[PDB]
Homo-oligomer: A and B are copies of this chain.
Amino acid sequence: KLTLWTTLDPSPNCRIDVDKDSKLTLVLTKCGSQILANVSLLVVKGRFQNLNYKTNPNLPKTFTIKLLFDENGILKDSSNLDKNYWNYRNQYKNAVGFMPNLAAYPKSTTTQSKLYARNTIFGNIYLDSQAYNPVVIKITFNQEADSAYSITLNYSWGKDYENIPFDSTSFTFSYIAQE
């Protein structure tokens, strides 16, 4: 009832560029009016598996993973996360109690040039369990115009990494629940 998560299954479950290029671990625990969230990310194959900006001049320093939800709090197929890996810890009918509160985190109006900053959380996370491999995780609620609710995970970094795996440490955050 009270936890929505990616399983701990070792199978890849997420698309950054290509199907199953990544494994997202996301745990959402309902503590009444707040969701306690825990996240980590491993890239298992493709261009972000091993970062080397000395040898690959064309490699970006960002990617984004989106969880898109309908008006019943059901994960949409268009999400980067595979629906087959998303369920209660013990497919579901209602998870509006896990959704980011729309009054707290309003969607952008047609006339609105961006979201309120309160819709965003920043975290400093690290690759390969080392403090000198920083990555910025930018978590934004309800940014995706075509979904009832959304959680957007933007990863970005500045370092010219040389043969560093995108294998992230864990980060905790919370957000205000819709109900």
Listed in ascending order, the chain A residues whose CB lies under 8 Å from chain B are 2-3, 5, 8, 25, 27, 29, 31-34, 36, 38, 40, 42, 89, 101, 103-104, 114-122, 124-129, 131, 136, 138, 140, 156, 167-176
Contact = CB atoms under 8 A, between A and B. Distances in A.
User: How many copies of this chain?
Assistant: 3
Given A8-B104, A32-B89, 19 more contacts: A2-B32, A2-B33, A3-B33, A5-B33, A8-B101, A25-B104, A27-B33, A38-B176, A42-B116, A115-B129, A117-B128, A117-B129, A117-B167, A117-B169, A119-B129, A122-B124, A122-B169, A170-B175, A172-B174
7 contacts: A31-B31, A36-B174, A118-B168, A119-B170, A121-B171, A122-B126, A170-B175
